[model samples]
Target: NETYMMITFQSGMDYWKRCLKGFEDAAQALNVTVEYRGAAQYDIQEQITVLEQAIAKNPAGIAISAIDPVELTDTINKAVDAGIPIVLFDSGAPDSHAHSFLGTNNYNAGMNAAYKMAELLDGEGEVAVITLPNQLNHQERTTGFKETLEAEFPAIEVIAVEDGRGDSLHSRRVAHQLLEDYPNLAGIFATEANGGVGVGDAVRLESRAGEIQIISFDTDKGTLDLVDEGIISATLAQGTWNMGYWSLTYLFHLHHGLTEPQILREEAPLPLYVDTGITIVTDENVDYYY
Candidate 1:
């Protein structure tokens, strides 16, 4: 079978496990193939180059979570112009015309997280945001978190947004810096999972776990444990499984030249936005997504 799909990730094997499982499962059921490509490191140029290469192959469809919006837009637009259907899986470019975006409602997730952070902070004290560098989705979350805190809870000052490079050790360094810089700091929000887990380690080592509040992006095992122990106040659990399943399902249909799934008079499977929303992972609900 010559039909194939191109799936791109920024850090292969880093965060692609869930989405890859979905891609592989759909490929198995749909009798198609997937060419997974991505950067060797956290490099935008490499990811875009992978996109251009995928475009050259003229695959049936391409699924991506581009590292940067402005940098990846031109190449993705080129692929779409060639009638190669493209769907953004995790991260997205709001300006580009990728058929549909299948991922978390990240901006709202940030705003929702801010509300929880405020509650954790008791509506006062300084807060810092930790995020991955150059990833649009994490950028959006950081931006939304700042805006919500500034607009709604003026008592809470957003001290700074720090770049952790999405590494656990790197995130710990940033977390430690934020702690030493601001004794009045009440909480920290991590825009992605790795950073969040790293932040947990930072707080634990500093012996300020319960003293400071944290609201993180995903429900990684370490993050969940922190919530259970009350070391981390909350975590924003993303719709991880849904992102995987739907990306492959959409790719399978597009590769076969099928229309967007919608309920028919006979009741067909519909093309719907799966929120796979961000949940507040207190001790109350941490077990649900984990």
Candidate 2:
């Protein structure tokens, strides 16, 4: 049996469910067995160890969601050099030799949130961002939101960008701090699911639910519920299922020698970058997401 592997950080989170399902679906269609393995914590060292173990097994192929962009590059390159087919999904190490990257155009997604926030606050107000600053995807989103607000929405000021560490409790604390620091804060953008829910909780707890508009990423149940109740003004939904399915497909093609490396510059069977896409979820479409 040709077995493949999927590795991620925060392995038990609900966010990985759809991606895992899509991976399994592709595995079934390809007639290959697949295994899921990763670090249960959000530690980069732990993730590196888990990845090393996976590489040692010498699986047919591997798909990974990197914890830290720079920290994982050497490990990912090691796997590539070992003749293992590797593809990155969700978070990525851009400097690594992964065959392809399948995820949202995070900068565009951030820009979309900025536009939505401007609309919510009538194009003028103070806003803040709660995100995992160390992750490449979140960093791109933060830059996109901040730059768009500076260039296009001149009246909107991004007063703060706080690290939430991708944890609900930490995000809640950060949100509370923002609320305290900027009483006139018109909006807040969360770059991940947990941060969204945490910010929503903080807003409601401070009795500012209707007053503070929230724009968050992902359609996790907590976030969708907040959107449905109008606690979250809107959320960005990524094509997560597509990311999973295509990452595996790319790996399969590479393992079978059906595609060439450096597909971005060369004529190959697959593209180097696949944008899974994103969508905005609001009250009108929140129920559909649930």
Candidate 3:
């Protein structure tokens, strides 16, 4: 059976667990095998190396969630040139020759989060962002949150955007520092689950769980538990299952020459982007998510 690959950074996270399940389900339906490969940690260099290795093996196709948008373009192009169909999910490099991107419109998700934050704080107070500053998806999330807060809610100030490094301990430290630096901080938005959990931990340690509201990305189990505990106010849930399922479907078509990117780009058929969608997860409906 032809096999495909799903590549990402921080592959072991609870978020990826659902993504993998979706991929596996699609693989089973399509009668193909799908394998996972990614950097063990938050290392773009390592992810790039992994991509190179995956490309070398020449799998039926590859689906990757880029760690850094710009850095992976050349490598992705190499795979396409090697005649291996490639698509991106979760994160993307626009310049890459990958055929499609199946993931959330991260910018819009961030804007949605901003509105939630405004409502939580009554459209007034300072909020900070803990993010993976360099990754394209997280960058868009940060930008959307900042720009929307500035444009829509004049009273809601986005005071700081710090890199969480996409790790729990580092994010906790950064959250703690942000609290100290912005003594009047009313909210924090974390771009990923680890960062969200870390921010929640810091808020609890400061004994400011209710006072310092948190809006985070992704519905990881830890983040969901925090939401249930009322420590974190809300989280944005991505269509991770959709990303994985559609990614394989697209790759299957690509491998079999069922469609063409040029044809898709000219008008419509296979779109360059497949918006997997997102949902606002809060205490009210958090029960369904778990």
Candidate 4:
């Protein structure tokens, strides 16, 4: 039997559970084994080391959610050079030689968040964004939201873009500061789950719950709970399961020699990218996610 590995940056987050479940399910379907490995923290070097260790085993294939877009390129390329089939999911490194990418389109997801925020504010107000400033996916989301607001909603102003560091405590502190600086802030968009919950906490502590609308990303239980409690106005739910499932499937095809990376790029055998999909989760539909 063949074995494949799924790698990520944050090993402890509940967000990875559904994704890994999908990977395991796919492994069962394909009659192959799958292993999960990741850095204990959000350190780029730690992730690189983990990838190198995974490569040393020379598994059939690798599916990864890169922590930093640029830093992972050389490591990913090294694996590819060694004949390991690689695919990126959730986050990506565009410059890398990975065969395919399967995940939500972060830029478009950001645009969607902007529209949702505009609708929440009735087209006019001050807003802020809390996110991981250096991460590619978060950056794309922030860009989409800002660009959409600037072009389509002139009445709306983005007062600040704060780095939450993808930590609940740090994001809470940032949100509290934003609330203090911009007392009239109508909304805040958090690019990840922890930030969303953190921002929600700040709103509640400031006695501003239901006053400032919050839009966040992902379907983690914490985010979903915030939506249910009316603390978060809405959250973008990525198709994490699909990302895990199709990643392995693609790797299976490549590892089996059913498709060649170069030809797959131009042919129907494998797509260069797949938009796994996203959904907007709000209070009304929040229970369904649970």
Candidate 5:
């Protein structure tokens, strides 16, 4: 069937829905089929099992967003050993034998958010970050945000960096605590849409609203709505569509002998890492995204 597998953890969130649509769009254009499979929850073991099962079937290829960057290495290498083309999207396992990574330059995206936060706060305030600390993308975001702030805006202090577990309720609790601890907190940066929503809720409960600038990631409807309402100052909208489209296209090229091995070590043929890029969203241009 020339069917490829797309796998991820927490497979059915709104963020993933747009990604799947792009995958389906490319699949239709290429006259190939795609089967989506992953853990319904944020469970790395389940995602590993799912990848193993898909690998056993020997599909045309596999595109996965790794839940645990290091833990997925053996499974991804096994698929490559079996001659199945593998690529990563959204979140990547750089240590794996995956052919390419198609996603944002997440570290740079965080820097963009940091700059925006600095502008909003006029470069001086107490800010914090809520993130999924274990995930590679979140880790990069945290690093980028921290480094950029320290380097460019010395007056702005990053008071705390906490794990939100990528869950809205947990993030909400964490945000609540941050607000309590940093009562004069001027800004908060959340690394995901759920975290953004949680932070927005906490801001509302604390009646800080626009007082505490929230810069969140992703353009999921909830986050966008908060931006529209001024509860969130802004958000980083990822090129999720490009990640889905190019991941499948790269798999197709590798499967059909359209790519060369030299391209792996070299930057050409096709980039081993496709940046995809990101945009900052705010009230001025929010309608276009929807």
Candidate 6:
């Protein structure tokens, strides 16, 4: 028999379903069992508690997305020391001792969004970003947005990044506040799902939807609708299914002693980094994810 484990920062229908479906597909293909765990909020201690529970049960392996990347290193190490192979997926802590990471190359994705936005803005104007606080993946997107615009378009400045805290209402407030603060702003980049959608809606309610180019993150339905309608210019689509399915597959493989050795981890078959992927979602093909 084979078994797998999982823990996400939050649970939602879209990304989680795809991930679970992938895991289910993998499970059906490989003949294994998987346990999905985590919190509705980004509670690291809660996630740690779940991991401890999984460890006590001694499942085949674990795949996790840490709320705080660095804070969970000790827990991940504990699993490794006990001979359970684990992999980091959807989020990563590079310093941890785990298997490969499977999530977005967030900085690269952010840079790509800037490229699209700069082209939309005709190379000279100010823009701002809104994002969820305390998420490394989201933080990376903000960093990517700033660095790319600075490096490639000297005339295009990224004015400020506001923390939206993953709340739609808060995102709205931040968006309106930004518009109030920087009326000349030419663009908006949303670094997380809720904030991006909130920003899009708030901007649309203004006379500025078409005037201010918007680039946002993730394919949650609300944002997808905005993209379809052309209120938001572009979004980063994550391969969410890969997060669930491959994670379970790897864990099941570990339980069965079937893991192919990590190419770079010397003695261990699993290293501590894996990047899933992100694709651009625009009006041209927003229907696919929807």
Better of 1 and 2 by lDDT: 2
List model 2 lDDT by residue over 54-94, tens digit each. 99999999999999889999999999889898999988788
List the candidate 5 regions with Cα displacement exceeding 4 Å. Answer: 165-170, 173-177, 263-270
By lDDT, the best candidate is 4
Measured with C-alpha atoms, the lDDT of residue 173 in candidate 1 is: 86
lDDT of 6 at 50: 78
Off by over 4 Å in 2: 133-135, 165-177, 180-183, 260-269
Q: Model 6, 239: alpha-carbon shift in Å?
A: 1.6
Clashes of 4: 0
* TM-score list, all predictions: 0.77, 0.87, 0.85, 0.89, 0.89, 0.89
Stretches off by above 4 angstroms in model 1 are 2-6, 28-35, 122-125, 132-136, 163-173, 219-225, 260-276, 283-290
Q: lDDT per residue, candidate 4, 178-250, as tens digits?
A: 8889979999999988899999999989888899999998888888888888889999998999999999999
**What lDDT does each candidate get?**
0.77, 0.89, 0.88, 0.91, 0.88, 0.80
Q: Which stretches of candidate 6 lie over 4 Å from their true place?
A: 132-135, 256-266
Query: 217-278, model 1: which lDDT tens digit per residue?
Result: 77668778888987788888766567766777876666566774554453223353556566
Kindly list the per-residue Cα lDDT of model 3 for residues 1-290, writing each as its tens digit: 59999999977766787778888999999899989988989898999999999998989989999988898999999998898988999888988878889988989989999999999999999999988876777888888889999899999888888888879899999999999999899999998888999999999998998999899877778989999999999999989999899998988888887873454444223578998988988899999888
Candidate 4 segments whose C-alpha is farther than 4 A from its true place: 260-269
Worst 10 residues of 5 by lDDT: 261-270
Candidate 2 colliding pairs: none
Ranking by TM-score: 4, 5, 6, 2, 3, 1
lDDT: the better of candidates 4 and 6: 4
